[PDB]
RNA sequence: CAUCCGGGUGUUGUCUCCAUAGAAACAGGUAAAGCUGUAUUUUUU
C-alpha cells in the first residue's frame, strides 16, 4: 500500500510537473510544481500556470492552492 | 474512524466517477480514511491520457465502479 | 424481621450471622461437598447396584431383586476360549457403566459423570492468596470506590461453596426430627483405618437410607 | 450511534435501492457499508438521471454524495429498533 | 473548555477575527457580501467562531431580476440573525 | 399444508426476535454464521448455548423455577433422557438464533453444541464439518488441556475460524480465590498456550477472538462489549478503539484523562486488571459479601442498572448470577466476537475444497448439500444437512450419495473426463434447529444447516445430496469425503440378543445406532457375533442405552470389552516364496516417522518420500500405497520396467487391498508395513480376466507369506490418557498405572494457578476397561481421567506370536510374552479360523514351509 | 521545506490577491493577518472583476470557505 | 393399594399491631426526583 500523504511527500521530494484540476470548475486547470505539504490536501505550488481546458496558456505567478478545492494531483 | 475496506479493489482498474459528470480511470494503488485515492494514471472520459500516477481527493468522488470483476 | 413471625415457618438472614452459624456447624457437618467424592456413592448408583446385585466395598448390599438365573451355557459368544480376561472386571465397574459391563440391566438408572474440583478452604487470618497451587510462567470504571476485599467476604465465598442449608441465606422451617445430621456422615464414604464394626454400622445406615 | 447507519448495515445483503445527489438510481445487492454511508453493491443496475439504464458488476459509492437509500419492506418488522 | 475559549479569544484578538471584533466594540455600520447576491449594510451586535452575526438596523441590497431587466431593491429590517456559510467578504466603511 | 405448519409453530416457544425475519435473513448468505461450539469435557459449551437460547426466547417451557433462579444450570440442548440423566451432552443438538451485534447488525447463527467428552469426538467432528467458525471453549482452571490443543490442530485441518471462549472466570475468582493480578497472569498464560497450539494466527482479547465467560454465573463478554456498555460515557468516540487496544497486555494506567502511559509508576494493577478484572472481582465481592443497599446504590451509579424488589431477596449465588446478568447484558458481545473472527468466505472456499476436493461452484443450475449427521430430534429420524449452494424447497426430489459412494464416484467422473442417478429421496419436511423443537420451514438455502425428514433411506452416517439439471452440471459437481471422525474407533464390543427370536429387531436397532451415532463401525461377523467399535466405554454405554431402551427394547447380551488388534512386523522379510492353485512378495517394517505422516503426481510423491524416510529415487518410483491403514506397496524387482506384464497396476493391487483389510494372523487388518514385490511369474497363455482373478488371491497369499517371514506381531492400540489429579494424589495415580500391565507416564504437566497435575499418559486400550472409574475411586473423586485415540497410535502386543508353549492360566490374565500369542489365538477363535479348544497358527504355502525353513 | 502555513505567515504585511467560488471575483490588497483556518484580513482591497478593478473596498475580512487561491 | 407423622397455596372469617383520604393535575413559577446534550474532505458552516 502507498498512502496519499506518502505520495504527496514523494512528489514534494521530486519537484516534478504537477497538473491540478479544480473542484466544481471544469473549464480551468492549474499546472506547476509542489513545494509545500500540510495535514490537509492544502499545498503551496511555485511556478504555477493556469490552463483553459480543450472543450495554449495563460499568465500566473506563484500560488498556494487551498485543500478544499483540489481534485487531481500527478507527479 | 473505520478505514474504507477497498482491499478487494487493490491493484484493479477502476472507473472513478468524480464531480461535475467527469470520469477518471486507472489501477488502484492505495487509500486512507478520507477516501483519498492513490492510483496509476489513465485517461479522462474520445479519450486521452494525462500523468503517470495520480492522487484523487475524497470529496470529489461520486463513485468508483470496478472495471475488473 | 429475620423471620415470618412467632409461627416460626419461614426464616431469612443476612450474611455475617449465617457465616458464623456455618463456622459453628463445621465440626459436626463436614460433609465433603466436592460432588465427585460421591462417584459410586449417589442414591442412583446404589439403586443401580441393587438392581445389578453388586457391591461397592463401602456400599450396601441387598437381596438380588430379580431371579438369580444363570444357564448362559457357553455359546460361540461368551465362551472361555473366545473372550480374553486381561482386566479383572470388578463390580465397581458394573454399576459405573450399568448398560455395558452388566448385560441384562433391568430397571437400572443412568448415573452421573462429573468434572474435577479445585478449591482452597483454610483456617487462617489472611484471605484471597495463592496457598498451594503451582506458579505461572512470567480511567478505571471504579477506582477508589472500593478496596476489593471487605471483611465479610473472607467467609462469604466459603458460604457460597457450602452444603444445602447454608448456601441459602433464607428458607422454610423443619420439624427438628427433620434435619438428620448423622445422615451426612454415613453417606460420606469413610472406610479406611476405622474398625470393622464402625464400617458395618455405616453400611447398615446406607442400606436403611437407600431402601 | 446513527440508527439509520445501523439499519443500512443490517440491510447488507439485500437488494437495496440507492439515489445520489446527481439523481442516478441504483438497485442491487448491498455488499458493505461504514459509519459514513460508504456503500458497495453487487450485480447492480445504474439508471441515468435522464432515463437510460446501464448494468454493472461492483459499484462503490460515497455517502456524502448519496441522497437516500431504499431498503426492502422485510426490515420494517425487526430487529434493530426494539 | 474555559481555557480553550480564552485561547480562541486571544487568537481572534491577534489574527483575522480582530477587525470584526474591533468593529463590534465600536459599533459602526458595515457592509457584508453574501453567496446569493445580498449586500447586507448593518450594525454588528454578536460574534462567534463561525462568523455568525446578530445584526441591527439592517439594510439588505439585491436585484430582483428576470431578464432582460434591471431593478435595484433594498429593504430595512430592525433586528436580524445571520449564518456564517452565506458570508464571503465583510467590510468596514470608515 | 398450511394448517399443519401452523400447528407445528404453535407447539413451540415464542421467540423475542421474529422467526419470519430470521427466515428472511436466511435467504441471504453472509448473514448466516454456522458456528460449532466445541471444547473439552465440561467446558460449559452446552450451558453457554442454553444462555443464548434463554436470551433469544420469551419464555422457555421446561425452564423450571430452580433453573430460573440459577441453581441447576438448564441445558436446553441436552434434550434426551440419556443426556439429561447422564450429565454429558452426548449428541449434536444445536439451535438457530438471530443475534444482534455490538452495533446491532442482526445476523442468524446456526449454533451447534458439540459434546466435550472425548469418546464423542464423532459429534465434534460432525460439528466441525458443519461449522465455518468454531467457538472453542476452555475451562480457565483445567487450562489449555491437551484435548483443547488437539481440537485446535484438527480445526486448522478442517478448516475453521477459531473464536475462543475462556469460560470459568468464576472458578478462579471464587474457587481458586486468585488475587486479581494472579488471575490476569493465569489468563495471559492460557492465551499464550492457545497461541502456541495455533500455527498461523494470533489470539488475544483485542481484535475480538477471546470471549471471557462463566456460564454457571451466566455472563459472557468481550473487551469491546465491556467498553460499549461501561466506557462510552467517560470518553469521546474517537479514542475508544485506542483505549481498547491499550486495555490488553503489559500496559498500565496512572492518573490522567485520558493518558494511560505503558509503564509506569508506584502502584501495580495493569490496564486489563484495572478496567476489567478488578471490576469483576469487586462485583463478585459486593454481590456475595456487601450489604445490599450499598451494592444497589453502586449499581445505580457506576453501571446504570436497577435491582428489582424481588431480586434483592435472592440467595447469594443466584443473586450474584442475576447481578452479573444485569451488568453484562444479553450476550451480544460474544456474537460480535464471532463476527470479527469469521473472515468471512476467504476461508470458506478452502474449507469446502478440503471437504470435497478443489474446483469451482455452480449456483443456479444445481443445489448441493452435505448431509452431515442423521439424528433423532423429535423422536423420528431427521438428517442435519448443510445446504452449501442452491436452495432446497419442501417436497423436492433429491439425489443422495453416502460418502462411501464418493471416492468411487469421483474416480468414475475422472474416467469419463445414458443418465444414471443411483438413489433418490422425496424431501417430506425441513426445519431449523433446535434445542427442544424443529421450527419447520419450506425453503432450505445456500449457507444454512437444517434438519430434513425424507433424507435417510439411501444414506448412512454422512452424505452428499444434490439436484442437477444437465451433464455439464454433473461434471462440475464434486462429492464430500467421509468425515475424519478424529478419534477413530478402537474399543470393541460383541453383541448377542438374549432371546434370538429377536435378532431381526436387534439388527434394525443396530442400523439406527450406526446412523445416529456416526463413530460406530458396526461389523456384522460371520459367526452371528455382531460387533461394535465405539470410541470408548462411555460412548458405547450411551449407545447401548439408546439401543436397549429406545431403538430396540430387548434384553441384549454384551461381551466383555475387547479391542481391534492389527498386524505388523519387527524384522524385514527373508524369503519371497510364491503360491499356486504365480506371484511372490515380501514386506519390510516401515519407518515410524513415515507411518505417523501417513496417519496424519509421481515426482511429487517421490519428493515427499525423500523428505520423510530417506528413500532413494528407485524406491520413490516403485511405490503405490493404499487404504489409509497404513501399508505401502512397492513394485521393486529388476525386470518390471522392461516388462509390460508388471504394467497395468490398477488390477494388480486389488489383492493387496484385500490383504490389508484382512490379514493372516487374525483376519484383522494389516498396519505399518512397506510391502515389496520381488517376482511375478506370469505364464504365456494370458486369458486376462482369469489371470487377474488369480492375482487377486495370489497377491494376498504373497503378502501373508511376507508378513510371516517378517516376524509379524499383533499391534494393540494405545489410549492416550488425560488425568487432571489434585497434585498430592499423583503418587496414587502412579501406583494405579504400575498395577496394570501396559501403561506409561510421559509428562506430569503442572497446570497454571491450580492444584491440578495434568498428568498425560499412554494406556493400552485393552487394559483400560473402566480404567476411568478405577482412577476416580482410588483418587476419591479427584482427577477426571479421559481416554482417547486421536493420534492413531498403535504398538507391539508384548512378545512373540507363533509360540505354542506360551502361557499357564485360562481364566486369569496371561504374562507378557505369553500374551503376545494368547490374544491372537483368541481373535482367531472369535473369527472362526481355528478348530478346537486347543489349537495353533501356521501359514501355507509350500513344501512343508520350505522344509521348516531348511530345519 | 516551505509548507503553506509558514509561507502564509511570511506573507503578512505584503500584497495578496484572492479568488472566490460562485460568481468568481478576484481581489487585491495588503495582508494584515491570517490563521490556521485560512480566514483573511486585507487593507486597500481592490475588486478585480475577472481582471477589471471595479471598486476599492479598503479594509476587509475574507471568510475562508469561498476562497480558491492566494497570489502575489 | 392404604395408614399415620409433617407441608403448603388460595378461599374466607376472626384475635394482637401499623395505618389514616374523601380525591388531585390546568397556565406556568418555586423545591426535589427520573432520564437526554464547540467551523478546514462523508452530514449542521
Ligand atoms: N464453577 C463453574 N462451573 C460451571 C461453569 N460452567 C458450567 N459449570 C458447571 O459444570 C458443568 C458443565 O456444564 P455443561 O454445559 O453441562 O458442560 P458441557 O459443555 O455440556 O460439557 P459436555 O457435557 O461435554 O458438552 C455443569 O454441571 C455446570 O453447572 C463455570 O463457569 N464455573
Complete DSSP assignment for F581-618? --EEEEEEEPPHHHHHHHH--HHHHHHHHHHHH---HH
For residue F194, CA distances in Å to F143, F152, F199 come to 10, 8, 10
**Of residues F293, F298, F325, the one with CA closest to residue F309:** F293
First to last CA, chain F: 82
C82 CB burial (10 A radius; 0-12, 13-18, 19+):
buried
Name F302's Cβ contacts closer than 8 Å, sequence gap at least 6. C141, C142, C145, F230
* Alpha-carbon torsion, ordered F629, F631, F633, F634, to 10 deg: 150
Distance of CA A49 to the CA centre of its chain: 10
Peptide bond into F654 cis (omega under 30): no
For C129-175, strand residue ranges (E) read 170-172
Q: Domain residue spans in chain B? A: 1-69
User: Is residue F444 marked as binding?
Assistant: no
What span, in angstroms and rounded, lies between the C-alpha atoms of C206 and F586? Answer: 65
**Of residues A59, A58, A57, A61, the one with CA closest to residue A46:** A61
Q: Specify the 3-state DSSP secondary structure of F183.
A: helix
DSSP class of residue F501 equals G
Distance of CA C136 to the CA centre of its chain: 32
**What are residue F275's phi and psi, to 5 degrees?**
-85, 0
Q: How many residues does chain F have?
A: 855
Distance of CA G12 to the CA centre of its chain: 11
CB–CB of F200/F162 below 8 Å?
no
What span, in angstroms and rounded, lies between the C-alpha atoms of F124 and F134? Answer: 10
CB–CB of D41/D31 below 8 Å?
yes
Distance H20 C1' – F767 CA (angstroms): 83
What span, in angstroms and rounded, lies between the C-alpha atoms of F115 and F117? Answer: 6
What span, in angstroms and rounded, lies between the C-alpha atoms of E71 and E68? Answer: 10
Name E48's Cβ contacts closer than 8 Å, sequence gap at least 6. none
Q: Which one is the CATH code of E1-94: 2.30.30.100, 3.10.450.50, 2.60.120.10, 2.170.260.10?
A: 2.30.30.100
Q: What is the CA radius of gyration of chain B?
A: 11
Name E58's Cβ contacts closer than 8 Å, sequence gap at least 6. E40, E41, E42, E43, E76, E77, E78, E79, E80
Range of the structural domain that residue D28 is part of: 1-82
Which cell goes with B63?
463513485
- In a 13 Å sphere around the CA of F483, the CA atoms on its Cβ side amount to 29
Named by the residue before each, gaps in chain A exceeding 2.5 A from C to N are 55
What span, in angstroms and rounded, lies between the C-alpha atoms of F102 and F125? Answer: 30
What span, in angstroms and rounded, lies between the C-alpha atoms of F33 and F608? Answer: 37
Q: Does residue B66 sit at the A interface (CB-CB below 8 Å)?
A: no
Q: How many residues does chain B have?
A: 69
Helical spans, DSSP H, in F208-365: 223-230, 240-247, 271-272, 278-288, 292-301, 316-327, 332-341, 347-356
CB–CB of F604/F623 below 8 Å?
no
* Alpha-carbon torsion, ordered F501, F504, F508, F510, to 10 deg: 70
Q: What's the CA-to-centroid distance between F277 and ligand 1, angstroms?
A: 22
Q: What's the CA-to-centroid distance between F381 and ligand 1, angstroms?
A: 28
CB–CB of F481/F385 below 8 Å?
no
Q: Specify the 3-state DSSP secondary structure of F829.
A: helix
* Strands F397-402 and F463-467, sheet pairing: antiparallel
* Alpha-carbon torsion, ordered F256, F258, F259, F265, to 10 deg: 30
CB–CB of E80/E55 below 8 Å?
yes
For residue D64, CA distances in Å to B36, D30, F257 come to 14, 17, 33
Q: How many residues does chain G have?
A: 72
Name C201's Cβ contacts closer than 8 Å, sequence gap at least 6. none
Inspect the interface and report whether the beta carbons of B57 and A23 lie closer than 8 Å. Answer: yes
Q: Domain residue spans in chain G? A: 1-72
Q: How many CB atoms are located within 10 Å of the residue F88 CB?
A: 24
What span, in angstroms and rounded, lies between the C-alpha atoms of F361 and F447? Answer: 13
Name F242's Cβ contacts closer than 8 Å, sequence gap at least 6. none
* Strands F673-680 and F631-634, sheet pairing: parallel
CB–CB of B55/A73 below 8 Å?
yes
**Of residues F204, F174, F213, the one with CA closest to residue F39:** F213
Range of the structural domain that residue A19 is part of: 1-75
What span, in angstroms and rounded, lies between the C-alpha atoms of F572 and F570? Answer: 7
F600 CB burial (10 A radius; 0-12, 13-18, 19+):
exposed
Which cell goes with A39?
495535514
What span, in angstroms and rounded, lies between the C-alpha atoms of F415 and A32? Answer: 67
What span, in angstroms and rounded, lies between the C-alpha atoms of G17 and G47? Answer: 9
DSSP class of residue F482 equals P
Q: Specify the 3-state DSSP secondary structure of F557.
A: coil
Total of domains in chain A: 1
**Of residues F689, F698, F672, F701, the one with CA closest to residue F792:** F672
Third-level CATH fold of B1-69: SH3 type barrels. (2.30.30)
**Of residues F838, F824, F841, F778, the one with CA closest to residue F562:** F824
What span, in angstroms and rounded, lies between the C-alpha atoms of F214 and C148? Answer: 20
First to last CA, chain A: 17
**Of residues F78, F92, F98, F88, the one with CA closest to residue F129:** F92
**3-state secondary structure string across chain B:** CCCCCCCCCCCCEEEEEECCCEEEEEEEEECCCCCCEEEEEEEECCCEECCCEEEECCCCEEEEEECCC
What span, in angstroms and rounded, lies between the C-alpha atoms of F716 and F567? Answer: 9
**Of residues F807, F836, F835, the one with CA closest to residue F823:** F807
First to last CA, chain B: 28
CATH class of G1-72: mainly beta
Q: How many CB atoms are located within 10 Å of the residue A58 CB?
A: 9
CB–CB of B16/B41 below 8 Å?
no
Inspect the interface and report whether the beta carbons of F179 and C100 lie closer than 8 Å. Answer: no
What span, in angstroms and rounded, lies between the C-alpha atoms of F715 and D15? Answer: 61
From the alpha carbon of C178, which nucleotide's C1' atom is closest?
H6
Inspect the interface and report whether the beta carbons of A66 and G69 lie closer than 8 Å. Answer: yes
Q: How was this structure determined?
A: cryo-EM
Q: Specify the 3-state DSSP secondary structure of D57.
A: strand
DSSP state letters, F207-227:
TT---EEETTTTEEE-HHHHH
Distance of CA F298 to the CA centre of its chain: 46
What span, in angstroms and rounded, lies between the C-alpha atoms of F640 and F618? Answer: 12
**Of residues F278, F322, F317, F318, the one with CA closest to residue F296:** F322
Report chain C residues whose CB lies below 8 A from the CB of F176: 118-120, 130, 133
CB–CB of F425/F465 below 8 Å?
yes
Q: Specify the 3-state DSSP secondary structure of E43.
A: strand
Inspect the interface and report whether the beta carbons of E94 and G22 lie closer than 8 Å. Answer: no
G68 CB burial (10 A radius; 0-12, 13-18, 19+):
buried
Measured in angstroms, the resolution is 3.7
For residue F756, CA distances in Å to C128, C161, D32 come to 18, 19, 48
For residue C110, CA distances in Å to C47, C49, F138, F541, F688 come to 10, 12, 27, 10, 60
Which cell goes with D12?
447488507
D64 CB burial (10 A radius; 0-12, 13-18, 19+):
middle
Q: What is the CATH number of the domain that holds D1?
A: 2.30.30.100
CB–CB of F165/F193 below 8 Å?
no
CB–CB of F821/F714 below 8 Å?
no
Q: Specify the 3-state DSSP secondary structure of D7.
A: helix
**Of residues F103, F106, F104, F114, the one with CA closest to residue F36:** F114
> What is the largest distance, in Å, between two alpha-carbon atoms of chain A?
38
Q: Does residue F89 sit at the C interface (CB-CB below 8 Å)?
A: no
CB–CB of E54/E45 below 8 Å?
yes
For helices F278-288 and F316-327, angle between their N-to-C axes, nearest 10 degrees: 140
3-state helix, strand, coil split of chain A in percent (to 5) is: 20, 35, 45
Task: Please identify which residue in the block is written with the cell numbers 500584497.
Answer: G15
Distance H30 C1' – C105 CA (angstroms): 83
What span, in angstroms and rounded, lies between the C-alpha atoms of F363 and F349? Answer: 14
Q: Specify the 3-state DSSP secondary structure of F825.
A: helix
F803 CB burial (10 A radius; 0-12, 13-18, 19+):
middle
- Name G26's bridge partners: G48
- Name F491's bridge partners: F534, F563
Q: Specify the 3-state DSSP secondary structure of F741.
A: coil
CB–CB of F423/F395 below 8 Å?
no
CB–CB of F811/C85 below 8 Å?
yes
Q: Which nucleotides of H are covered by protein (CB under 7 A)?
A: 6-8, 35, 38-43, 45
What span, in angstroms and rounded, lies between the C-alpha atoms of F202 and F121? Answer: 25
Inspect the interface and report whether the beta carbons of G60 and E91 lie closer than 8 Å. Answer: yes
Name F841's Cβ contacts closer than 8 Å, sequence gap at least 6. F665, F801, F802, F824, F825, F828, F834
For residue F241, CA distances in Å to B1, B7, F224, F335 come to 9, 21, 9, 18
Which cell goes with F479?
462429492
- Name G53's bridge partners: G48
Name F614's Cβ contacts closer than 8 Å, sequence gap at least 6. none
CB–CB of F52/F108 below 8 Å?
no
Peptide bond into F845 cis (omega under 30): yes
* Strands A43-52 and A63-65, sheet pairing: antiparallel
What span, in angstroms and rounded, lies between the C-alpha atoms of F465 and F479? Answer: 9
F580 CB burial (10 A radius; 0-12, 13-18, 19+):
exposed
For chain A, strand residue ranges (E) read 17-21, 28-34, 43-52, 63-65
C108 CB burial (10 A radius; 0-12, 13-18, 19+):
buried
F240 CB burial (10 A radius; 0-12, 13-18, 19+):
middle
What span, in angstroms and rounded, lies between the C-alpha atoms of E29 and G61? Answer: 15
Q: What is the CA radius of gyration of chain F?
A: 30
**What are residue E35's phi and psi, to 5 degrees?**
-65, -45
Q: How many CB atoms are located within 10 Å of the residue C183 CB?
A: 13
Amino acid at each position: 500500500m502507498v498512502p496519499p500523504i506518502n505520495c504527496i511527500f514523494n512528489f514534494l521530494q521530486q519537484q516534478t510537473p504537477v497538473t491540478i484540476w479544480l473542484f466544481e470548475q471544469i473549464g480551468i486547470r492549474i499546472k506547476g510544481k509542489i513545494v509545500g505539504f500540510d495535514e490537509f490536501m492544502n499545498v503551496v505550488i511555485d511556478e504555477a500556470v493556469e490552463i483553459p481546458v480543450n472543450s495554449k496558456g495563460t499568465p500566473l505567478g506563484k500560488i498556494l492552492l487551498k485543500g478544499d478545492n483540489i481534485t487531481l494531483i500527478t507527479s | 474512524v473505520s478505514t474504507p475496506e477497498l482491499k478487494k479493489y487493490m491493484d484493479k482498474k477502476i472507473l472513478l466517477n468524480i464531480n461535475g459528470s467527469r470520469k477518471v480511470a486507472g489501477i488502484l494503488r492505495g487509500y486512507d480514511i478520507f477516501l483519498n485515492v492513490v492510483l496509476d494514471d489513465a485517461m479522462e472520459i474520445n479519450n486521452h491520457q494525462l500523468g503517470l500516477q495520480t492522487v484523487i481527493r475524497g470529496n470529489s468522488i461520486i463513485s468508483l465502479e470496478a472495471l475488473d470483476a | 424481621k429475620k423471620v415470618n413471625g412467632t409461627s416460626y415457618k419461614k426464616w431469612s438472614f443476612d450474611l455475617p450471622e449465617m457465616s458464623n452459624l456455618y463456622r459453628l456447624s463445621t465440626p459436626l457437618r463436614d460433609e465433603v461437598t466436592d460432588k465427585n467424592y460421591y462417584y459410586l456413592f449417589d442414591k442412583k448408583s446404589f439403586f443401580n447396584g441393587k438392581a445389578l446385585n453388586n457391591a461397592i466395598p463401602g456400599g450396601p448390599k441387598f437381596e438380588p431383586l430379580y431371579p438369580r438365573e444363570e444357564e448362559e451355557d457357553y455359546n460361540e459368544f461368551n465362551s472361555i476360549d473366545r473372550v480374553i480376561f486381561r482386566v479383572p472386571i470388578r463390580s465397581e465397574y458394573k454399576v459405573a457403566f450399568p448398560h455395558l459391563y452388566n448385560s441384562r440391566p433391568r430397571s437400572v438408572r443412568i448415573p452421573w459423570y462429573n468434572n474435577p474440583v479445585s478449591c482452597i478452604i483454610q483456617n487462617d487470618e489472611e484471605y484471597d492468596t495463592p496457598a498451594l497451587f503451582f506458579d505461572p510462567s512470567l480511567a478505571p470504571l471504579l477506582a477508589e470506590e472500593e478496596e476489593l476485599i471487605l471483611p465479610n467476604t473472607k467467609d462469604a465465598m466459603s458460604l457460597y461453596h457450602s452444603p444445602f442449608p447454608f448456601n441459602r441465606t433464607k428458607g422454610k422451617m423443619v420439624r427438628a426430627q427433620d434435619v438428620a445430621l448423622a445422615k451426612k456422615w454415613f453417606l460420606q464414604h469413610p472406610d479406611e483405618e476405622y474398625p470393622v464394626k464402625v464400617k458395618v454400622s455405616y453400611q447398615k445406615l446406607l442400606k436403611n437410607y437407600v431402601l | 450511534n446513527g440508527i439509520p447507519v445501523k439499519l443500512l448495515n443490517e440491510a447488507q445483503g439485500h437488494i437495496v435501492s440507492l439515489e445520489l445527489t446527481t439523481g442516478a438510481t441504483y438497485r442491487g445487492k448491498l455488499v458493505e457499508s461504514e459509519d459514513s454511508m460508504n456503500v458497495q453493491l453487487r450485480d447492480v443496475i445504474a439508471t441515468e438521471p435522464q432515463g437510460a439504464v446501464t448494468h454493472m458488476d461492483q459499484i462503490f459509492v460515497r455517502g456524502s454524495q448519496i441522497k437516500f437509500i431504499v431498503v426492502p419492506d422485510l426490515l420494517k418488522n425487526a430487529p434493530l429498533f426494539k | 473548555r474555559a481555557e480553550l475559549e480564552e485561547l480562541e479569544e486571544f487568537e481572534f484578538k491577534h489574527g483575522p477575527m480582530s477587525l470584526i471584533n474591533d468593529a463590534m466594540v465600536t459599533r459602526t455600520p458595515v457592509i457584508i457580501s453574501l453567496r446569493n447576491n445580498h449586500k447586507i449594510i448593518a450594525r454588528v451586535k454578536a460574534f462567534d467562531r463561525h462568523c455568525n452575526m446578530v445584526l441591527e438596523n439592517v439594510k439588505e441590497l439585491w436585484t430582483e431580476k428576470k431578464g432582460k431587466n434591471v431593478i435595484n431593491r433594498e429593504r430595512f429590517i430592525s433586528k436580524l440573525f445571520l449564518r456564517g456559510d452565506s458570508v464571503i467578504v465583510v467590510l468596514k466603511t470608515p | 399444508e398450511h394448517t399443519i405448519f401452523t400447528q407445528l409453530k404453535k407447539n413451540i416457544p415464542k421467540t423475542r426476535y421474529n422467526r419470519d425475519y430470521m427466515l428472511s435473513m436466511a435467504n441471504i448468505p453472509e448473514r448466516i454464521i454456522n458456528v460449532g461450539v466445541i471444547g473439552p469435557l465440561h467446558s460449559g459449551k452446552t450451558s453457554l448455548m442454553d444462555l443464548l437460547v434463554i436470551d433469544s426466547h420469551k419464555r422457555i417451557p421446561d425452564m423450571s423455577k430452580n433453573v430460573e433462579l440459577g441453581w441447576k444450570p438448564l441445558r436446553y440442548l441436552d434434550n434426551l433422557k440419556q443426556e439429561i440423566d447422564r450429565g454429558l451432552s452426548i449428541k449434536l443438538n444445536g439451535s438457530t438464533l438471530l443475534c444482534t451485534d455490538l452495533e446491532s447488525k442482526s445476523r442468524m447463527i446456526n449454533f451447534l453444541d458439540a459434546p466435550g467428552h472425548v469418546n464423542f469426538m464423532d459429534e465434534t467432528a460432525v460439528a466441525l464439518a458443519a461449522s465455518d467458525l468454531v467457538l472453542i471453549v476452555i475451562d480457565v482452571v483445567e487450562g489449555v488441556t491437551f484435548v483443547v490443543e488437539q481440537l485446535i490442530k484438527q480445526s486448522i485441518k478442517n478448516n475453521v475460524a477459531m473464536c475462543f471462549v475462556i469460560n470459568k472466570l468464576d472458578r478462579l475468582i471464587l474457587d481458586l480465590k486468585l488475587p486479581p493480578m494472579d488471575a490476569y497472569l493465569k489468563l495471559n498464560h492460557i492465551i499464550a498456550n492457545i497461541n502456541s497450539f495455533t500455527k498461523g494466527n494470533v489470539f488475544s482479547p483485542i481484535d475480538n477472538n477471546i470471549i471471557f465467560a462463566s456460564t454457571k454465573l451466566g455472563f459472557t463478554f468481550t473487551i469491546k462489549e465491556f467498553v460499549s456498555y461501561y466506557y462510552a460515557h467517560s470518553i469521546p468516540s474517537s479514542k475508544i478503539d485506542d483505549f481498547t487496544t491499550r486495555l490488553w497486555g503489559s500496559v498500565y494506567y496512572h492518573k490522567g484523562n485520558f493518558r494511560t502511559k505503558p509503564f509506569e509508576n508506584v502502584e501495580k494493577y495493569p490496564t486489563f486488571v484495572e478496567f476489567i478484572l478488578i471490576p469483576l472481582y469487586k462485583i463478585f465481592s459486593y454481590a456475595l459479601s456487601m450489604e445490599k443497599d450499598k451494592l444497589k446504590n453502586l449499581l445505580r451509579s457506576n453501571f446504570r442498572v436497577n435491582l428489582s424488589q424481588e431480586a434483592l431477596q435472592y440467595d447469594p449465588q443466584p443473586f450474584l448470577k442475576h447481578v452479573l446478568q444485569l451488568i453484562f447484558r444479553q450476550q451480544t458481545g460474544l456474537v460480535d466476537a464471532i463476527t470479527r473472527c469469521y473472515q468471512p468466505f476467504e476461508l470458506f472456499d478452502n474449507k469446502t475444497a478440503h471437504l470435497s476436493i478443489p474446483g469451482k461452484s455452480t449456483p443456479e443450475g444445481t443445489l448441493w448439500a452435505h448431509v452431515l449427521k442423521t439424528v433423532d430430534y423429535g423422536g423420528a429420524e431427521w438428517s442435519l444437512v448443510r445446504i452449501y449452494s442452491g436452495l432446497l424447497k419442501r417436497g423436492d426430489t433429491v439425489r443422495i450419495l453416502d460418502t462411501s459412494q464418493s471416492e468411487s464416484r469421483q474416480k468414475r467422473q475422472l474416467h469419463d473426463i445414458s443418465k444414471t442417478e443411483t438413489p433418490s429421496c422425496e424431501v417430506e419436511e425441513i426445519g431449523l434447529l433446535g434445542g427442544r423443537y424443529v421450527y419447520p420451514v419450506h425453503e432450505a438455502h445456500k449457507g444454512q444447516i437444517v434438519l430434513i425428514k425424507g433424507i435417510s433411506s439411501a444414506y448412512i452416517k454422512s452424505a452428499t445430496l444434490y439436484s442437477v439439471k444437465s451433464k455439464e452440471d454433473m461434471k462440475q459437481l464434486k462429492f464430500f469425503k467421509p468425515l475424519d471422525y478424529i478419534t477413530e474407533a478402537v474399543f470393541k464390543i460383541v453383541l448377542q440378543p438374549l432371546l434370538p427370536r429377536e435378532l431381526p429387531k436387534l439388527l434394525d436397532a443396530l442400523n439406527k445406532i450406526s446412523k445416529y451415532y456416526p463413530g460406530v463401525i458396526i461389523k456384522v461377523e460371520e459367526s452371528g457375533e455382531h460387533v461394535i467399535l465405539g470410541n470408548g466405554e462411555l460412548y458405547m454405554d450411551c449407545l447401548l442405552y439408546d439401543l436397549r431402551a429406545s431403538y430396540a427394547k430387548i434384553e441384549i447380551k454384551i461381551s466383555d470389552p475387547l479391542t481391534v488388534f492389527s498386524e505388523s512386523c519387527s524384522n524385514e522379510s527373508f524369503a519371497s516364496i510364491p503360491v499356486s492353485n504365480s506371484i511372490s512378495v515380501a514386506a519390510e517394517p516401515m519407518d515410524s516417522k513415515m507411518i505417523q505422516d501417513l496417519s496424519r503426481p509421481r515426482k511429487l510423491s517421490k519428493i515427499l518420500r525423500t523428505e520423510y524416510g530417506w528413500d532413494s529415487l528407485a524406491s520413490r518410483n516403485v511405490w503405490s500405497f493404499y487404504n489409509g491403514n497404513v501399508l505401502i506397496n512397492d513394485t521393486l524387482p529388476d525386470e518390471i520396467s522392461p516388462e509390460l506384464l508388471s504394467k497395468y497396476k490398477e488390477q494388480i493391487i486389488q489383492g493387496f487391498y484385500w490383504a490389508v483389510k484382512e490379514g493372516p494372523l487374525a483376519e484383522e487388518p494389516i498396519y505399518g508395513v512397506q510391502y515389496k514385490l520381488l517376482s511375478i511369474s506370469v505364464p504365456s497363455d494370458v486369458n486376462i480376466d482369469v489371470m487377474k482373478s488369480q492375482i487377486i488371491p495370489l497377491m494376498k497369499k504373497a503378502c501373508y507369506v511376507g508378513l510371516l517371514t517378517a516376524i509379524p506381531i499383533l499391534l494393540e492400540p494405545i489410549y492416550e490418557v488425560d488425568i487432571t489429579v489434585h497434585a498430592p494424589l499423583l503418587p496414587i495415580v502412579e501406583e494405579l498405572m504400575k498395577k496394570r500391565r501396559g501403561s506409561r507416564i510421559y509428562k506430569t504437566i503442572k497446570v497454571a494457578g491450580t492444584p491440578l497435575l495434568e498428568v498425560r499418559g499412554q494406556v493400552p486400550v485393552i487394559e483400560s476397561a473402566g480404567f476411568e472409574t478405577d482412577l476416580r475411586l482410588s483418587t476419591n473423586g479427584l482427577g477426571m481421567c479421559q481416554l482417547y485415540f486421536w493420534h492413531k497410535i498403535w504398538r507391539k502386543v508384548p512378545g512373540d506370536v507363533l509360540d505354542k508353549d506360551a502361557f499357564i492360566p485360562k481364566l486369569k490374565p496371561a504374562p507378557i510374552n505369553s500374551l503376545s500369542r494368547d490374544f491372537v489365538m483368541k481373535t482367531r477363535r472369535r473369527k472362526g479360523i481355528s478348530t478346537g479348544g486347543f489349537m495353533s497358527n501356521d501359514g501355507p504355502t509350500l513344501e512343508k514351509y520350505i522344509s521348516a525353513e531348511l530345519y | 521545506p516551505v509548507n503553506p502555513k509558514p509561507f502564509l505567515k511570511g506573507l503578512v504585511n505584503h500584497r495578496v490577491g484572492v479568488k472566490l467560488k460562485f460568481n468568481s471575483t478576484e481581489y487585491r490588497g495588503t495582508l494584515v493577518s491570517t490563521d490556521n483556518y485560512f480566514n483573511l484580513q486585507l487593507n486597500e482591497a481592490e475588486e478585480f472583476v475577472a481582471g477589471v478593478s471595479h471598486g476599492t473596498l479598503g479594509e476587509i475580512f475574507i471568510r475562508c470557505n469561498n476562497v480558491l487561491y492566494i497570489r502575489e
